Design a protein around this ligand. Structure first.
Ligand SMILES: Cc1cc(C)c(CCNC(=O)[C@@H](N)Cc2c[nH]c3ccccc23)c(C)c1
Length: 330
């Protein structure tokens, strides 16, 4: 089998991407944030504290003839940025395009933190990291991809995120028309539960490529590109007036700037992030200071190749017996 669904930026800055997902019988369609940095499929629901719902579409398991409460199962997730959610668990039928998993764990939120409430465009997250990170207790549950993998024509999914435009998540096949050149594959460590890999270096604009190992995760659920402070300083030094602001929380730059590109290495291959991808707009409404899309990882503990980097590439998440990551230009 295969599946294919269009993923759409939630706003004019590409702050996140939402993909329609069918849950239950009859189908309830929710717009989920496909997150290769976590492993829980959780949704706003009829159980969610009413004051914590503000425009999201909810899953109502009592209206699904295939939903079954997973007795005694609860979940609770604390993302590294300080957001969180928790609740109870149903098994139900979940489809992404033409791809269907019966008996998928659907984690129904009873509580969400304020940032999720305040984002009316995201109805939940669909985790695509490794199932060892799943938070359901006392019986850990599998991700949608893990459940689907044996049925897929090939045990893969691909992320093709657009810049200010829709893109595509494919399951079970590689669309050879969706990229230029070839796909370069690179090793993955699964020990921490992430799609953890090592970039071979970077360049700023037309500058000389620096060969240096940069360990990090491929995380479709993170907006920005978070890299070591040395790398980030080298980038913003090329932008007149850019500076790291403690009050704002990272590098800011004049909104009148035209930004240089940023290149990262995948083996001997190179992915070029165009400069415009690194502009995340005014720091506050009406400001002439803009927030940078490349930021220091120093306070995080790991480098994060988030959407800023991933949207410049066609990315293969290869779930073969030994997982690997593939990147192509597009
Ligand atoms: C200090 C610090 C700061 C950041 C930015 C991060 C990355 C957080 N990014 C995720 O954890 C996403 N994989 C998932 C995610 C978290 N919050 C969301 C809100 C909306 C949509 C998706 C999500 C970490 C690990 C640590």
């Amino acid at each position: 089998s295969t599946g294919s669904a269009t993923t759409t930026p939630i706003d004019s800055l590409d702050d996140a991407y939402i993909t329609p997902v069918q849950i239950g019988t009859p189908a309830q369609t929710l717009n989920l944030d496909f997150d290769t940095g976590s492993s829980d499929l959780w949704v706003f629901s009829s159980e969610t504290t009413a004051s914590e719902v503000d425009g999201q579409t909810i899953y109502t398991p009592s209206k699904s003839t295939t939903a079954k409460l997973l007795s005694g199962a609860t979940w609770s997730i604390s993302y590294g940025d300080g957001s969180s959610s928790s609740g109870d668990v149903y098994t139900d039928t979940v489809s992404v395009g033409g791809l269907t998993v019966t008996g998928q764990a659907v984690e129904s939120a009873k509580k969400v933190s304020s940032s999720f409430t305040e984002d009316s465009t995201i109805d939940g997250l669909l985790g695509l990291a490794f199932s060892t990170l799943n938070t359901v207790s006392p019986t850990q549950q599998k991700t949608f991809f893990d459940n689907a993998k044996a049925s897929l024509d090939s045990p893969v999914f691909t992320a093709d995120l657009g810049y200010h435009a829709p893109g595509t998540y494919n399951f079970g096949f590689i669309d050879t028309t969706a990229y230029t050149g070839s796909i370069t594959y690179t090793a993955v460590s699964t020990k921490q539960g992430f799609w953890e890999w090592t970039s071979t270096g970077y360049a700023v604009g037309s500058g000389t490529f620096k060969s240096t190992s940069i360990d990090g995760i491929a995380d479709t659920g993170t907006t920005l590109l978070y890299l070591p402070a040395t790398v980030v300083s080298a980038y913003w030094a090329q932008v007149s007036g850019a500076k790291s602001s403690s009050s704002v929380g990272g590098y800011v730059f004049p909104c009148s700037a035209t930004l240089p590109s940023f290149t990262f290495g995948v083996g001997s291959a190179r992915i070029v992030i165009p400069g415009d991808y690194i502009d995340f707009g005014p720091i506050s409404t009406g400001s002439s200071s803009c927030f940078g899309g490349i930021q220091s990882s120093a306070g995080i503990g790991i480098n994060i190749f988030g959407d800023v980097a991933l949207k410049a590439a066609f990315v293969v998440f290869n779930g073969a017996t030994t997982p690997t990551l593939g990147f192509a230009s597009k």
